[PDB]
Nucleic acid binder design. Sequence first.
RNA 1: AACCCCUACCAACUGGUCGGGGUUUGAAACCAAAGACGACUCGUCCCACAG
Length: 906
Amino acid sequence: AKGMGVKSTLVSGSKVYMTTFAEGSDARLEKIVEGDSIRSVNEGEAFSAEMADKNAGYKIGNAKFSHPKGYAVVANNPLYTGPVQQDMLGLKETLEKRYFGESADGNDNICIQVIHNILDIEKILAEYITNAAYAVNNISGLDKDIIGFGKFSTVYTYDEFKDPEHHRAAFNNNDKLINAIKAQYDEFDNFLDNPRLGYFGQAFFSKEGRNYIINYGNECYDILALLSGLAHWVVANNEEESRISRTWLYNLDKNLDNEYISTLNYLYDRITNELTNSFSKNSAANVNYIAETLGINPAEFAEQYFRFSIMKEQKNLGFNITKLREVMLDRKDVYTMMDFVIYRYYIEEDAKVAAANKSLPDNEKSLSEKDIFVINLRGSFNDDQKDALYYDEANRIWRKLENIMHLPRILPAGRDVSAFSKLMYALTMFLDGKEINDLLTTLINKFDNIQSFLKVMPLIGVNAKFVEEYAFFKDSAKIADELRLIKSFARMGEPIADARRAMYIDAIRILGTNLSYDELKALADTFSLDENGNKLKKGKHGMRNFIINNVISNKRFHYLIRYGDPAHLHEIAKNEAVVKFVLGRIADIQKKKNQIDRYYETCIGKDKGKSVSEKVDALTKIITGMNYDQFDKKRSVIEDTGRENAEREKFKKIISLYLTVIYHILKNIVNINARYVIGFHCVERDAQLYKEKGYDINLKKLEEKGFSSVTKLCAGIDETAPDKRKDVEKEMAERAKESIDSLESANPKLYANYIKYSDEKKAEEFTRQINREKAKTALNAYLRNTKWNVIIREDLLRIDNKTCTLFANKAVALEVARYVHAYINDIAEVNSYFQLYHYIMQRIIMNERYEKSSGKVSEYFDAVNDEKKYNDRLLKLLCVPFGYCIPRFKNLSIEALFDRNEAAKF
RNA sequence: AACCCCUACCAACUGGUCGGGGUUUGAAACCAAAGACGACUCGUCCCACAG
Ligand SMILES: [Mg+2]
């Protein structure tokens, strides 16, 4: 009933406190239910709350914009089942004891929602931190993992790390530890001398004058130690605590050092000073037109900037926030001016008719017309009609008629910004634009939900408070505001302008080349050195500028270089099967000139009559035939007076399409691998939770025994022992006989007709009763269902713990994204990125565990070898560690339920 | 869309039917914010320019 305005809570003490739409400085608690009560805390009759059917439902109704639109009746009642609504994992008590400690004696269900939001934060952070760690390990080029567990962390400063001999007291006088620190310092010294640091120029380089100069080693060591500490914190589930605890990200203010704090403050101050200089200088690009279109004085309309474009916030006299705005779909009609003029229209209803004159009467304006439009748009029922409200709103804002043609310190410094937000910004310094947007949006939404729940808790009678270890979440509103601010400018410049010979060789490699390394070095030197060894004069750098503007300065190429190898990606792009699938997938978006037609016109020519399939085939032929020798022989493209301009633009478009295809492939692979990364993170988290719960599970041997330990624990009684098999069978047979004898007391009395005792429904239901008795011993609401319990017990008897451990270890290291180049050309047919990723993973596991495996797993390996496609049974056997959660097990093992965006195809 | 919980009718109940609910299940409640998703034209990669 979200469309009618129902965001009600369920359990709070012994009453049902039905909440409503928050974030409006009003309507925090609408209805309160105790027994058969219908009393309302607030006034106004937002929605009806009469008890439907008087047994297990509350009939909700509304007056306008929230009609059921047909035969429908809304009903819900939490207290009908008796006790509080237990979580399906059966760990809400442990979660409340961990995060809240002495909660409201378990008689609440908003604390568990806050804890689930925290867990979602942890999942998304672990995913993106693993991605950033893999990117740093790939760009570093070293075989040794410099970010994973075992390397340096935020415990030692740069002075102690550089000179471990004079700081022997800090390392507990351990000679092995001192030797390890010396080895790590040697690796760090080799890391600074790596010319590939320009890829992470936002974190390891500083902009000053005209070139980029590497900052001091202090900041670089601080950033690397912060990344390593994040990597240690996201893996703090197998080990309880050795040096970095689980609350490290929350106690950073007490765990980090002044050096790391100063590094984060320096980064934040640098980016904020750049933003301030930009807002002071480049304002004339828009204020010159705004002064004529909805503008009186240059100091008046400029106040909206630095808060609208650089902050994406409102912070007006009302209570609406970034999540309570209207996208407006760019008015569905240049773009920069029209977006600001329309934003300036409905913003006056929050300052001109605000509480300065509206607080005296009930409402001066039409009850906050912005919030009223939000409520009218809140009718999520039949969302295919929400776009009609934008059309009606566009016909209402026509009174503007202004779209004819179309200084002080605003942002905080590094001191009044949380270390959490500064570390999130430093982490986004290692991610792409899409990844940054997704991560920051998820974090903003989760923190906003957390702060809303924390504001609702005291009014519904919940006095739960966070422990000292998790008291960081008390500032969730400030955290969300800082994250919104950071997201507003976290995508301003990925690469640097100081590209080197290494980057030139990488650009030549990704464009296709078979020359030796010495020949590549010579060709890269020819970009800046003449035929006599001197640097080229000004104006003779045409080829180098072209390569820069086409390859190195491309965000897609940056994403490709962070997660992949240029030669490997070039070998990937030579396969016509996958390229035709990617190009064919772009042609399917035309249902929403065409993109394929534009690509064919800009890359191949203005030929007509060619069908879509022929255009895709031609684009595949010109993309698979990509080679740098095409641009080398035509190096005369440096002339840009107008003759070779057509060929230059054609080459630009071809390179753009090539990089776009490879970027799509790699991004899909990474997004699919991140799902199983999050899955194994959840497996480890729930393992630790069930260990803290009081059950029998070995967190030390969950690696050797396979990650299916949680699945075996939640399945119930373990029957994986030959001596215990007969005992368990006899006990379950006795239980089934007792249940059959005791069933004859109710509507299942009809069992007296389905009995023949030879092989009929009698013995059939006897076996099914044995199965459900085995199922009732489960420890969670998922595996308590007899169907899923039987499926899990069948999957457990044929499990391969070594194969599961290998799959878990390879899912975190992105070995699929590493070895895709070696197994992409061994596929019979590519149907989707899901099947591609899983075939590559199974091929890697086979290459590692073919001669060592046996039993049914060898049959699945042989089937994969013969059929040249992924095996669904082998996949669902690898998802057994996910067996404790049935939705996750079904989403990560079934292709039709994996992707939510591709659900329309299935 | 998978899963879970519901009043009415059947149904070992590991089946279903009209409908509702789930931020307390899965990337995963409303509005927004991302993503699938590549573009179009006007402050982001236009070269009047930049090693
Ligand atoms: Mg959730």
